[PDB]
Each structure stands twice: as C-alpha cells, then as structure tokens.
Amino acid sequence: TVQVPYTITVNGTSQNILSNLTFNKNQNISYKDLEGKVKSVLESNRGITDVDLRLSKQAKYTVNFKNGTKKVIDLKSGIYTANLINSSDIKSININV
Amino acid sequence: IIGGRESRPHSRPYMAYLQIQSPAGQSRCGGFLVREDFVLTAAHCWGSNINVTLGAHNIQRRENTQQHITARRAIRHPQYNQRTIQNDIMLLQLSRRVRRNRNVNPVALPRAQEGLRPGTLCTVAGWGRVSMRRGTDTLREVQLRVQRDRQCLRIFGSYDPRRQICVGDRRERKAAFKGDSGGPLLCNNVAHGIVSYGKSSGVPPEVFTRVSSFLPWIRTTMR
C-alpha cells in the first residue's frame, strides 16, 4: 500500500514517464522478489528479457534508501544478498542496462 | 520540467494529466487534447486503465475547473517499438466528449508533413519532476530550441530524424523530465512534438515524437 518510484535506462535512453512500483506497507521482502519486480517492469516498459540482460555489457539496479545510502545490485549475478529488505525503507530504484 | 517556470493558470487548456494503471504499479504522464473526444500522448504511457484529467492547474487540488474522464480506448501506434522507443505515439479515445470552455479546449495539429528547422523555439509543458530531488503539483513550462539532428545522433543510438525531433540546447539546463511524457511540444501554438525520452540525468538534448510524421494515422484513427 505504498508506491516506490523507479526509472529505467536501456542503451542510454530513458522514457520520460513517472513510474512507480506497488509494495505492501512496512513489509519485509526478499531480494529475489525485488529482482522479480525489477525484471517485470523491464519487460513491460522496455521489452527487456532475461537473455537481453545476459548479453548486455552491464545490467544493474540501485536501491536508494530513505536514509541517503544506496545499494547497487547486479542483475547478471546469482547469489542473492543474504537478507530481506523492508518496503518502507526504499526511496527509489534506478534500473540501468 | 527542468529549468522552467510555473504556467499561468489555465493558459494551456489542452493539457491533459494521465493516471495509468500498470500491472506492478501506477504511472503518470501528460497528454494533450486534439479533439473533444481524443487525447494524444506517448505509447509508452499505455496501461490497462487510464483516467484523464482536463482543465487542471494544480492536479493535487480538486479544482472546480477539472474534468475527469476515463479512456474508453488506448490506441498505440501499430509499429510502436518498446525496446528502441520508436513510433512512440498513442491516441486515447475519451469515454465521453469533454465540455468545452475557456479552461478545456483542444490544440491545433500541424499542417501537412512539416519539418522543423533547427533553431526554432518551442514550448513544452508538464507536471513532471523538476529535478532528481523534487517534483511539482502545478503545471510548468519552458522554452527550448530545436537542435540540428547531429546533437541526438551522437547521444541516442536509435534516434530517427524522419519521425523524431531533437530538442534542447545542452548548455542550458532546460528539459522535460520524468512525468512529462506525452506532453506537447508547441511551436507557434501548434503541437509538433510529443515528449518521449532522454538521458536518465535529464541533461538536454532529448527526443520528441514528430507529430507531423503521424498525421495520416492520427486522422484515420479518429475518423
């Protein structure tokens, strides 16, 4: 019941849309699920699939936290960060392929 | 809108504010009325359900002048290419006709198949973010300069000058930004462009859909 803005850049270009992801308020979710949302909007906004992420030079998303820190996560990697993340700690998400 | 000023209230009565339902969340875009029953916007603003607000200045207040209308149909251009953001144009058929008044009325489209000379001054308006840090509740606007095609050909890998316009001097920090998609680029009071895409940073130049390239399709779809 909270909205978290995200942006998507693919091959240097970024739609000028104001886009949000819906999250349950104050819910701990895993980074496997957060990656699922990220991959979902890459597909629905820009038609980017899993094979496209494998062959890109770099593919990452950055979680910006309300406390001013950030976490940079690699979409080409396995090994989920041993952890869960709270929904109401996220300021925004920047996706970069 | 980056580097702009607040619009005079209701000075741009063709402006449309779109609330879009996506599978994973909500989006927000601009658009513009081109006939009492049709709004023109960007195809990447498509969603399953679209509510359209006309007559607004402060979209976070519920002004008496606003008209709220759902889109009955959202017609993406048949060759819209999501990956490259090509043919990024969409028509929304309103579920009812707007009531015309001083605050709500459509904007002129180009005469036939017009190009756009570099150096031309054009205005863009929108409710998008003003920087990486804050947005706006009221309509803003900024005047930009059409660039020679080389400015975007060096920067954007899929820019096509036949169907897109390169807009915005790099030196000035003036541009459309997140939330401004689908808004009009007006040159002498005619809608020649549609806010489409740019750099993630918002630094100009940016790419607009060239409306004149789509005039036959727009006229056919409305008819």
Is the CB of B76 inside 8 Å of chain A's CB atoms? no
- Cβ atoms of B26 and B81 closer than 8 Å: no
Q: Nearest 5°: phi and psi at B188?
A: 50, 50
User: Partners of B21 in the beta sheet?
Assistant: B26, B49
- Chosen from B21, B134, B196, B197 to mutate, greatest number of chain A CBs within 10 A: B197
Please identify which residue in the block is written with the tokens 């007559």: B55
Note whether B112 and B205 are same-domain residues: yes
Note whether B58 and B92 are same-domain residues: yes
Active-site pick, B7, B57, B180, B181:
B181
Domain that holds residue B84: 13-106+213-223
Note whether B86 and B157 are same-domain residues: no
Please identify which residue in the block is written with the tokens 């043919």: B87
Note whether B113 and B208 are same-domain residues: yes
**How far is it, in rounded angstroms, from Cα B158 to Cα B85?**
8
* Chain B residues within an 8 Å CB radius of A19: 22, 25, 27, 178
* Chain B residues within an 8 Å CB radius of A46: 82-83
Give the dihedral sign, CA B52/B55/B59/B65.
Answer: negative
Note whether B83 and B162 are same-domain residues: no
Q: Name the maximum alpha-carbon separation found in chain B.
A: 47
Note whether B115 and B208 are same-domain residues: yes
Note whether B75 and B166 are same-domain residues: no
Q: What angle do CA B176, B180, B181 make, to 5 degrees?
A: 110
* Shortest Cα distance, chain B CAs vs residue A39, angstroms: 11
Note whether B144 and B204 are same-domain residues: yes
Note whether B136 and B150 are same-domain residues: yes
Please state the domain count of chain B. 2
Of B98, B82, B95, B14, the C-alpha closest to B46 is: B82
Q: What angle do CA B115, B86, B219 make, to 5 degrees?
A: 60
Note whether B66 and B130 are same-domain residues: no
Is the CB of A67 inside 8 Å of chain B's CB atoms? no
**Bond from prior residue into B110 cis (ω within 30 degrees of 0):** no
**How far is it, in rounded angstroms, from Cα A49 to Cα A54?**
9
Note whether B50 and B74 are same-domain residues: yes
Identify the DSSP state of B64.
T
Q: What would you report as the CA-atom Rg of chain A, rounded to the nearest whole angstrom? A: 13
- Cβ atoms of B122 and B193 closer than 8 Å: yes
Note whether B120 and B205 are same-domain residues: yes
